[PDB]
Design an enzyme around this catalytic site. Sequence first.
Site, PDB file in Angstrom:
ATOM      1  N   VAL A 187      88.614  49.376  78.180  1.00  0.00           N
ATOM      2  CA  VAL A 187      89.490  49.231  79.341  1.00  0.00           C
ATOM      3  C   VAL A 187      90.431  50.412  79.463  1.00  0.00           C
ATOM      4  CG1 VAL A 187      89.473  46.717  79.166  1.00  0.00           C
ATOM      5  CG2 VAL A 187      91.344  48.014  78.149  1.00  0.00           C
ATOM      6  N   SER A 188      90.841  50.706  80.687  1.00  0.00           N
ATOM      7  CA  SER A 188      91.998  51.575  80.896  1.00  0.00           C
ATOM      8  C   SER A 188      93.292  50.924  80.377  1.00  0.00           C
ATOM      9  CB  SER A 188      92.152  51.907  82.380  1.00  0.00           C
ATOM     10  OG  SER A 188      93.129  52.915  82.581  1.00  0.00           O
ATOM     11  N   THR A 189      93.518  49.672  80.771  1.00  0.00           N
ATOM     12  CA  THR A 189      94.775  48.986  80.465  1.00  0.00           C
ATOM     13  C   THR A 189      94.645  47.470  80.194  1.00  0.00           C
ATOM     14  N   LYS A 210      91.048  51.056  74.588  1.00  0.00           N
ATOM     15  CA  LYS A 210      91.902  50.655  75.701  1.00  0.00           C
ATOM     16  C   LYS A 210      92.671  51.823  76.343  1.00  0.00           C
ATOM     17  CE  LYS A 210      93.699  46.846  75.153  1.00  0.00           C
ATOM     18  NZ  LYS A 210      94.436  46.166  74.054  1.00  0.00           N
TER      19      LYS A 210
END
Lengths: 119, 115, 119, 119, 119, 115
Positions: free
Chosen positions: F9-11, F37
Amino acid sequence: MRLFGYARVSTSQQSLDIQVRALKDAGVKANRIFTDKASGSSSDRKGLDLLRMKVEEGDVILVKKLDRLGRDTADMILIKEFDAQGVSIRFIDDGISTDGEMGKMVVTILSAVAQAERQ
Amino acid sequence: MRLFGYARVSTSQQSLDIQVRALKDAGVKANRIFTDKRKGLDLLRMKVEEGDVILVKKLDRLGRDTADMIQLIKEFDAQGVSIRFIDDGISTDGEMGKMVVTILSAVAQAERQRI
Amino acid sequence: MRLFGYARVSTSQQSLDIQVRALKDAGVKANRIFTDKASGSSSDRKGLDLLRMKVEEGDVILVKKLDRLGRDTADMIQLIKEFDAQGVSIRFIDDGISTDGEMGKMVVTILSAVAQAER
Amino acid sequence: MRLFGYARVSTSQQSLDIQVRALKDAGVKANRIFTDKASGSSSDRKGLDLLRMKVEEGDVILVKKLDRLGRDTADMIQLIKEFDAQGVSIRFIDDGISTDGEMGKMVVTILSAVAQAER
Amino acid sequence: MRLFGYARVSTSQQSLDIQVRALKDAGVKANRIFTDKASGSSSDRKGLDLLRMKVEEGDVILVKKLDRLGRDTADMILIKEFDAQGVSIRFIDDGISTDGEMGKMVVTILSAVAQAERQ
Amino acid sequence: MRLFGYARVSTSQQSLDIQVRALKDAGVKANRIFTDKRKGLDLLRMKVEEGDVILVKKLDRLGRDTADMIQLIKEFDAQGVSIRFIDDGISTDGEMGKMVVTILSAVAQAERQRI
């Protein structure tokens, strides 16, 4: 004085060319040679008309022989009108001119012939 | 010098006596006036000699056609004979005579082209 | 309005007869047909020269095609403008084209365009 | 009426920009300007081909000069007649010439006359 | 089957010429090579438009490399519409086609990338 | 054969547990799911061996840019390791794997022209 040239045929282009070449050979510039060719058109037939417009008193028209100037003898006694304009004619082959005393004789004799012709 | 005259009518006898008087008046002796109404002309021809002078009233008295005229003038010329054409102002003496031959030759040529 | 006729012609009698007949068939009197030899110099066109003197404002010159008038497009244009300035219009029989007013204004415009596009 | 623009162009960008700008200055939208390389074959003119599909009866194609339309006079004439048959006229900006009706009928007549007189 | 050729530039004529020569060298006749050059005009930009009109089902378009077909990856997934028309594309340098099972993979992968691109 | 998983994930931590479940669901043991992440990726890289197969949800999970993707795929390829991109229908096994390299190389070139 300026020299002009006059050549005349009824039918023949050949004698046209024989006279025009003669007129140049006598020293008339090519643009001062007017011709009449009865079988041409108003312009081929109005070479004399143009010539009348170009001349000034003191100028000279060269014609190859005496018969080339007019249709007939009454016709050629043209001499009068060009003499009115102070313009002399000079017939190359016959070595006569139409100016001064010699020109007086030429008209005297020619009138005599034309009046004879009416006989 | 020696003076001849030539007078020719087609038909009028009356006018023949009128020309003949006119030449007689110009000084011509009557044996020297030749006439036609062509034997007259043949005699005078041509008859004449060196130094002669022929008087004619007009140029058209002399001859049939300009060519015939030239031939007559040279024949007379050769012999030292000259013509005065009284009414026309023309003479065959000297220069005016050369002119007349020159101009008549040119007119005659026209006529052979006409023939 | 008096009708005149004009033609550039080559040097043969055949070439002249053909142009003279074509203008006579178009209704022009024979004494009003003027021609120039196509060979010749353009500052010495005797026929145009005589034609220029004889026209009056309102007259029309008939010509068979565009090529029987001018030596080239630039020559055609200058002649159309010359005669136009004298009140005289030109009518090209075979092509159908005329230069009286409107169409006349268009013809010199198209002719120059073609002058350019050809040049 | 919708305005289109057409140009024959040479192979350089300069030659294209010049023709595109000239037609944009004449009011034609940029997406309605079609060009063909002047080098190419006349049975494969992609611009004329697309232009033929997009015009409607009543539209006008602007062209800068006569030489920017056709490969030669005969080519100009055939194209003017093609578009004329679809109800579309051509307008040559610089020359001033148009082909809507009357003047249009005259232009193909003069152009053929010139076709001939030049040929 | 008939072979067509498609070449595309934004600016460069040089790479245009590099692709067109390639397309001929691959066997496309010169009149079946359509190009797009964003700096041209509607016609220089409607090479694909024309191409759509020329093809039939079963024909093949040759393009030099995969990036030459579209502006972007979404753009080139053109593949769908030409496949609608039953027309296969074949990218010369990368040695992939868009027909049958291999053509299915090409779109699967390309969709994946374009969706990635949106990331 | 031996199966790994990679999730990134990005965030969103939430979605990281969502991918991880998805891979666990595809059969991947939890000690074999690596996540970011980029240490997660660097461990899996490394960890893998000849014959292993890595499961990733989508192509855009794997790498920063298409060029980075190509470099990853060749590194795994060299070792006899393959990727399944679950949601995309793509696999790097055999032919579809050659295709994927061919097509991604071409896309990557575009991007160096973009740079």
